[PDB]
Structures are given as structure tokens and as C-alpha cells.
């Protein structure tokens, strides 16, 4: 019994094939390169990825199909859902919708080490998540822009190539002087719009690019670290887990590691392929729910563009 | 009695900005915990201040935190509404309201004010209302409706322009994906 | 331990400043011994705001950055006075200025409370003595 | 037109489900066996994706 999972909530079209034993029979992704939409990229890429998936393993082998229902863009979720429905009907095999953020959390848990308070930071979604009282809730989140989104916007303004995560990281690696920008932390929330605006102003002031980038990364990762600390105190989680694309930054990784060591807790990040938006996470989560009796029908597979982690039901735990 | 509060230098962050933020937060907390009593809001007294050491020594209040008994005694929700509408009327924009920034022994004091700010922006007030709503929902979702209703009743009692900002609040709540 | 005294009906004389190590305040405006103790603590530990520590005590008691205004708000006047000094000098100042020793001149009555509130612009809810302590402590800002 | 009828039937059974998940339509559209241009292009994209999944 194995599953084939599709991730299309964002610019990344990911196709994976995952077994019930926990292994990954196959995995691959394509990151949409903005010059169309993420939905068009999903439509034009899922055929090729699925053909490759059959090439690796016979199409008759995959016992389940899973797709990222949400949260995420509208058209992208539409395309992934329709492709998954077509696959399920053609193979006459079950189809299941999975929560993409919960997929991130679960793939991270599987590919590393239990119940990690998960800082999910990406280019369109930043929030701290944790499984408490039988449901995965957001214990903190942005209010205007996402940390990855803010860094990417800063990159476009400063002409840094897309993506700017690893680029801003390398430019901050050689920074000493800190510019003054607002440090907005409302309870367990952040407003990266203020930070992005302040960085815009500082850049408009002729500040050293390295200095401003270092300051922005320090600010943003510091607030993320602080809300992660607050959510750890709130939840007493046994380990932080940085997930999403922005996990590629060693600067953020070391700030989180320093925090967690200070709090006598462990900080984890899974492999590079699994951190980003992969099909393997979708396949793993869909098969996780299928293993415990999550029977979904055609009528139940509509898209949920604002799918909240609190809108999910979890039995796999 | 009296207690001393310090903004320790968290190692994980940059020492320069760490000290800068600790100093700024200590200064803002002192200034606004003092200015809050100009509006009749109970609060601890600032007996002594130390910016260099980031140590502020203030009166100690022997009362259960709001988050501890707010659900058990819903009237504390009304009191929080009153002592937040006082802030908003006076434009002292508390940016980090939670049910842990208040103590209840005989009267409801406001303990922490680290992130406070003076602003006449109703949008900011709506944002901070949403912040408190999210905090109370996360901590005691089981009683979010009743606690929120009593808090808004207090807000109405003390603050008059509430509706305007409350309308604004709804708009801010509508910041999601189509 | 610094010596603080409250004298009623003291005959203020200018040439005392010529003799020169002491500070004179308006006993009515100054709240109570807590005001003086907070002033001395702030003058000793915190960064002094004035060149001379002795009148730095007066500046601390005044509660605002400016000095001459501290003088006119809390500077002593004819009659009642509050003397802060370090024994023999206290006796000499008592003999010269004159007056009657009365600790009650430093305590707070209704009239004294209204004086304090009017002078310090304390418009809020809270104990007067704690509020003046807080006002002096908040001098470290702006 | 379609090369045959079975392929059209499968494409319809696959896309009409997505069609019925959006209640508010810009204008009347026949789907059976400037905003209008873009919307029709969207359904064309849906039909394409659906057929090339096979």
C-alpha cells in the first residue's frame, strides 16, 4: 500500500510517491520561475512529474492519491485538486485532500526527530504551529506579510535575484553595523510590513547594502525566535522545528539553535528537498490519514484557499 | 513590598540590537506605566529606574493574573475592557495586550507596558484589539465569545468611539486570501 | 545618614549662602521624608543632573530638568523650611536661620496635598507620595 | 468539437465539478454536452489541464 502526493499550494509543483512503511519511493519538485500563474505551472508540470512517477514505479502500484487542498492560492489549489481528481478517477483509486502546512509539519517530523513546535516560515506563509488539545493550532503568525515574502520583496527592491533567502543570508554573513528599524511583536504576532517599509526607507537613505540586509535579517529572525520562545513557554514543546523555504538560511538556523540551547530544547531542520514545498510531504500526509480511515469522496474534494490548521482533523498522531 | 524587573540580554540575538531593544523597552515601559495612572487606571508604582542595568523596581501587587481568573470570573473581562478603552480614549496604544498584562487582587492593575505607544490612529487601536482577541482565543478559546462580549461591554462603557474602530477591526480581520 | 529637618518660622537670610554643604527646600511643597529620601537616593546612585550634589538634591526633588525653575518651585522661602545637611553645621544653620523645629511641618495635610498636586500637575489616580516618588524617578527620560 | 465522445464525456465529468465550486459567475456561460474573455480562458485552461492529465 503506497500513495502518490501532489503539492500545488504555491509556486512549487511537487510530486512524490511514499510507502506506508515510511520510506519515499520517489520525490521531485519544480519551483515555478516567475517571468502565467502557479496554477498554470501546476497544470503544465503535473503531467510530466506524474509520467516520471510512473516511470519509477508502475502506475498500478500507487494505492492512494493525495493533494494539497490548502491553505494556498485559489487557482493553484484548483489545478492541483482537478489533477488529483483526474488521477484518482483514471486509476479508480481513492483521493484525499491534505492540509499543506500540516504536511510540512508531518514530513519534518517523519524525516527528523516527534511533536516539534514548528516555525513554518516560507515565501507566502509564516506562522508558528503546534499540536495541542487534539488539533494543530497557529500559536503566532504574521499580520500583513510573511517573513519569506518580506525578504523576497526587499530582494526585488534591492534587485536581489529571486529567491533572496540564501542571498540575503550571504549578504548578512558580512554585516556588523545595525540599522534602526521597528521591532514589532504584538503578543505572539508580527507585522513584517513595518520591517519591510523601514528597510525600504533605510535603503533609500543610502545605507550600506550589507548593513541593511544584516539588520533586516537580525530583526526578522529575532522576532521569529522570540515568538517561538513564547509559544514554547505556552506549549512547553520539546523541540523547535524550522520548516518552509526560509529554513535554507543558516543565520536563522543558528539564531534558533542559540535560542533552543538557551531554553534547554532541541532545534531541527529536515533535508533541503523536504524543507521546501515537496510532493513527498503531501503523499506522506495523505497516506497518514488514509492509514487511520480518512475516507474522502469526490464531492468532498473542493479547494479551501484559507484552509486553517484548526480546520483539520488529526488521527495519525 | 516591591519587585525588580529586568530585560535580560538574550544570547541568541545580536548584542548591539539586544541592548538597544532592552533599553528602549525599559524606557517605554517606565514612561507608559507611569502615564497610565493619569487616566485612573490602577498600575504598579515605578519606585526606581535603571536604564544602564535595564532594571526597573516597582511596587509588587499581590493578585491573580487576569488570564488565571478571567474565565472563572467574567467580570474581569469587563474590567479589562474598561482599562483598555481608557487607554484608547487617551490614545495610549498598547501594542501587546494579553490577559497576562493585568493583575486582579482588589482592583485590576495593568502590569506590563513594554510595547506601548502613543498614537491617535484608530487603525492601530483596532489592530491591538485584534491582538488581544487572538491572545484570548488562543489561551481560553472555550470562553472567547463571552469574554469578548464582556470586554466589548466595558469598552463601550468607558470608550465612546469604539464602534468606529470596531468596524475597522472587522476590516483588519478580513485580511486573508481571496 | 544624612540629616533632614523641618523648621517652622525660620528666618531666611541670604548670607547663609556665603557661609557655605547644605540645601534648603520649601517644607510645604515637598511631600514628606519619602520625597527627601528618594531625592538623596537618586542624587547618590543615578547620574547627577547638576554640578553640585547638594543642590542636585533640590533639582531631584523638583522633578524636571531645568534648575532655576527647580529653585522657584522648591527653593526655600521665609518661614517654614526643610534643611538637608550632613550635626555641627546643622546646629549652626539652625542658630543663624532660626525658627522652631517641627517634624509635622514635613508631613502631608489636605492643604499640603492640594499644594503638591497643583505644583506637580499630578492629574491622575494614585497616592500623592507615591506619585511624587514616581515623578522624580521618571526624571531620567526625554 | 472533439475527436470522439468518450474523451469529451471524461473531460466534462472532470471539469464541471470545478465549475460548480464557484457560484458567482460574471455572465451566462454554456457548459454542457473583457471579464468574459479571461473567464473563458480559465475554463479552457481547466479543460486542457484535465485532458493532458491523461
Curated annotation (Swiss-Prot), chain B:
- Intracellular or extracellular location(s): Cytoplasm
Q: Where is the Protein kinase domain?
A: 1-178
In this protein, the active site sits at 96 (proton acceptor)
The source's superkingdom equals Archaea
The residues the record assigns to binding ATP are: 5
Q: Outline what the protein does.
A: Required for the formation of a threonylcarbamoyl group on adenosine at position 37 (t(6)A37) in tRNAs that read codons beginning with adenine. Is a component of the KEOPS complex that is probably involved in the transfer of the threonylcarbamoyl moiety of threonylcarbamoyl-AMP (TC-AMP) to the N6 group of A37. The Kae1 domain likely plays a direct catalytic role in this reaction. The Bud32 domain probably displays kinase activity that regulates Kae1 function. In vitro, exhibits low ATPase activity, but does not bind DNA and does not have endonuclease activity.
Q: Subunit notes for this chain?
A: Component of the KEOPS complex that consists of Kae1, Bud32, Cgi121 and Pcc1; the whole complex dimerizes.
The family annotation for this protein states: In the N-terminal section; belongs to the KAE1 / TsaD family.
The protein's name: Probable bifunctional tRNA threonylcarbamoyladenosine biosynthesis protein
Q: Which organism is it from?
A: Methanocaldococcus jannaschii (strain ATCC 43067 / DSM 2661 / JAL-1 / JCM 10045 / NBRC 100440) (Methanococcus jannaschii)
Q: Which residues of the full protein are shown?
A: 356 to 533 of 535
